[PDB]
Design an enzyme around this catalytic site. Structure first.
Site, PDB file in Angstrom:
ATOM      1  N   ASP A 175       0.847  -1.187   0.000  1.00  0.00           N
ATOM      2  CA  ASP A 175       0.000   0.000   0.000  1.00  0.00           C
ATOM      3  C   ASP A 175       0.885   1.241   0.000  1.00  0.00           C
ATOM      4  O   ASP A 175       2.046   1.197   0.412  1.00  0.00           O
ATOM      5  CB  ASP A 175      -0.948   0.032   1.208  1.00  0.00           C
ATOM      6  CG  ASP A 175      -2.370  -0.387   0.862  1.00  0.00           C
ATOM      7  OD1 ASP A 175      -2.816  -0.185  -0.288  1.00  0.00           O
ATOM      8  OD2 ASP A 175      -3.049  -0.923   1.762  1.00  0.00           O
ATOM      9  N   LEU A 198      -0.651  -5.593   4.605  1.00  0.00           N
ATOM     10  CA  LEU A 198      -0.600  -4.437   5.484  1.00  0.00           C
ATOM     11  C   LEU A 198      -1.649  -3.432   5.036  1.00  0.00           C
ATOM     12  O   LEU A 198      -2.080  -3.423   3.878  1.00  0.00           O
ATOM     13  CB  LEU A 198       0.791  -3.793   5.499  1.00  0.00           C
ATOM     14  CG  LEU A 198       1.348  -3.337   4.151  1.00  0.00           C
ATOM     15  CD1 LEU A 198       0.892  -1.917   3.841  1.00  0.00           C
ATOM     16  CD2 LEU A 198       2.870  -3.431   4.124  1.00  0.00           C
ATOM     17  N   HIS A 199      -2.041  -2.571   5.972  1.00  0.00           N
ATOM     18  CA  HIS A 199      -3.098  -1.603   5.735  1.00  0.00           C
ATOM     19  C   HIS A 199      -2.964  -0.507   6.780  1.00  0.00           C
ATOM     20  O   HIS A 199      -2.785  -0.798   7.966  1.00  0.00           O
ATOM     21  CB  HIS A 199      -4.470  -2.275   5.833  1.00  0.00           C
ATOM     22  CG  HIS A 199      -5.573  -1.536   5.145  1.00  0.00           C
ATOM     23  ND1 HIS A 199      -5.837  -1.685   3.799  1.00  0.00           N
ATOM     24  CD2 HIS A 199      -6.499  -0.669   5.616  1.00  0.00           C
ATOM     25  CE1 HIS A 199      -6.874  -0.936   3.470  1.00  0.00           C
ATOM     26  NE2 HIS A 199      -7.293  -0.305   4.553  1.00  0.00           N
ATOM     27  N   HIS A 207       2.274 -14.761   8.716  1.00  0.00           N
ATOM     28  CA  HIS A 207       2.036 -16.195   8.655  1.00  0.00           C
ATOM     29  C   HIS A 207       3.054 -17.017   9.437  1.00  0.00           C
ATOM     30  O   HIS A 207       2.961 -18.249   9.429  1.00  0.00           O
ATOM     31  CB  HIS A 207       2.036 -16.665   7.194  1.00  0.00           C
ATOM     32  CG  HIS A 207       0.884 -16.157   6.387  1.00  0.00           C
ATOM     33  ND1 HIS A 207       0.819 -16.296   5.018  1.00  0.00           N
ATOM     34  CD2 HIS A 207      -0.246 -15.508   6.753  1.00  0.00           C
ATOM     35  CE1 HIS A 207      -0.304 -15.760   4.575  1.00  0.00           C
ATOM     36  NE2 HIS A 207      -0.969 -15.276   5.609  1.00  0.00           N
TER      37      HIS A 207
HETATM   38  O1  LIG Z   1       2.177 -13.650  -0.256  1.00  0.00           O
HETATM   39  C1  LIG Z   1       1.380 -14.528   0.179  1.00  0.00           C
HETATM   40  N1  LIG Z   1       0.032 -14.063   0.408  1.00  0.00           N
HETATM   41  C2  LIG Z   1      -0.963 -15.007   0.909  1.00  0.00           C
HETATM   42  C3  LIG Z   1      -2.267 -14.439   1.191  1.00  0.00           C
HETATM   43  C4  LIG Z   1      -3.288 -15.309   1.686  1.00  0.00           C
HETATM   44  C5  LIG Z   1      -3.024 -16.660   1.883  1.00  0.00           C
HETATM   45  C6  LIG Z   1      -1.729 -17.200   1.599  1.00  0.00           C
HETATM   46  C7  LIG Z   1      -0.671 -16.366   1.095  1.00  0.00           C
HETATM   47  C8  LIG Z   1       0.714 -16.983   0.805  1.00  0.00           C
HETATM   48  O2  LIG Z   1       1.168 -18.023   1.676  1.00  0.00           O
HETATM   49  C9  LIG Z   1       1.986 -18.966   1.120  1.00  0.00           C
HETATM   50  C10 LIG Z   1       1.427 -19.078  -0.273  1.00  0.00           C
HETATM   51  C11 LIG Z   1       0.917 -17.696  -0.572  1.00  0.00           C
HETATM   52  C12 LIG Z   1       2.013 -16.689  -0.911  1.00  0.00           C
HETATM   53  C13 LIG Z   1       1.852 -15.933   0.426  1.00  0.00           C
END
Ligand SMILES: O=C1Nc2ccccc2[C@@]23OCC[C@@H]2C[C@@H]13
Length: 306
Positions: free
Chosen positions: A230, A271-272, A285
């Site tokens: 963003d 992000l936001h 994650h």
């Molecule tokens: O950049 C990423 N965005 C997101 C957004 C939602 C769910 C999963 C992901 C990811 O998790 C590993 C595979 C995929 C690339 C990663």
């Protein structure tokens, strides 16, 4: 490249695949949990977060004809307080705060089945630019373009057309619109995660993009790359670098990052900004959690604030 290490504060936790941070017109905060499963199949969730306590309330558990959703990214509408949600199984959703929802499009303007979507961004004219790194929506089997170049880019226009505007991306992820100072949409930026590239286009009108060029490059040796992104109010682009433990900061003209933001976690996914503040909310994650930190300046106003 200079690095800053601001203090991060935990917001909430225990959110499978935490992503899609977004504020609605009342200042309420939402995220998505794409990876929730029930009886062994997708059953992702859209949640409202109490900002004081981090308490989580499930707003919506989207399913269409027995196929559960993988909601992945969000934006708030302007003329109504409703969330546009990119869903990797269901395409584009409009989710109401009362929990009701609609699948907005299942086919594009050429009549082909939609691809599952992940991130989206409104321009100030009300057109929604969308990345679609997955294969076809449910009822098709689920696949994603991590290794093959089949991810696509869409524009959902104010006239209700779902127009595929580019294709052949290796996991298109974050997407953002740069506007002229006078408000006219100027550039579209798209993260191609698994090539470590940021792409730019010139926006010539609704669903009209030209002048496709490589705009920036994402550092890192890790698996991953640019995820959510963003603009701040100076049109610096802040880009989560999934797997690198950093958010990259690009100047208006792209290239290499001019600064990096160290995160206390490896996999920032999105992000936001909180409206009218310097506060950035970040999903990640490594812990499947949400944090906040203070940036140097306010965010670029979102469509829902215009
Ligand atoms: O950049 C990423 N965005 C997101 C957004 C939602 C769910 C999963 C992901 C990811 O998790 C590993 C595979 C995929 C690339 C990663």
């Amino acid at each position: 490249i200079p690095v800053i290490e601001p203090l991060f504060t935990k917001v909430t936790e225990d959110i499978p695949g935490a992503a899609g941070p977004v504020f609605d017109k009342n200042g309420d905060f939402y995220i998505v949990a794409p990876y929730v499963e029930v009886n062994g199949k997708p059953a992702g969730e859209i949640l409202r977060i109490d900002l004081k306590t981090g308490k989580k309330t499930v707003i919506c558990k989207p399913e269409v004809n027995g196929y559960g959703g993988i909601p992945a990214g969000c934006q708030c509408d302007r003329d109504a307080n409703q969330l546009f949600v990119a869903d990797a199984r269901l395409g584009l959703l409009v989710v109401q705060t009362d929990g009701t929802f609609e699948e907005i499009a299942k086919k594009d303007s050429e009549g082909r089945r939609m691809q599952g979507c992940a991130y989206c961004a409104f321009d100030y004219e009300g057109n929604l630019w969308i990345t679609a790194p997955a294969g076809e929506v449910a009822p098709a089997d689920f696949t994603i373009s991590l290794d093959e170049k089949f991810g696509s880019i869409y524009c959902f226009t104010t006239d209700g057309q779902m127009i595929q505007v580019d294709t052949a991306f290796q996991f298109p992820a974050g997407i953002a619109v740069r506007h002229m100072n006078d408000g006219r949409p100027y550039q579209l930026i798209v993260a191609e995660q698994r090539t470590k590239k940021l792409w730019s286009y010139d926006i010539k009108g609704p669903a009209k993009i030209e002048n496709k060029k490589v705009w920036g490059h994402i550092p890192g040796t890790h698996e991953g790359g640019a995820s959510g992104m963003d603009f701040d109010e100076d049109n610096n682009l802040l880009v989560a670098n999934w797997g690198s433990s950093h958010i990259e900061v690009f100047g208006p003209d792209g290239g290499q990052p001019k600064m990096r933001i160290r995160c206390p976690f490896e996999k920032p996914s999105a992000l936001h900004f909180k409206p009218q503040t310097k506060t950035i909310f970040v999903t990640e994650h490594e812990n499947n959690a949400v944090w906040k930190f203070e940036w140097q300046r306010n965010g670029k106003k979102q469509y829902c604030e215009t």
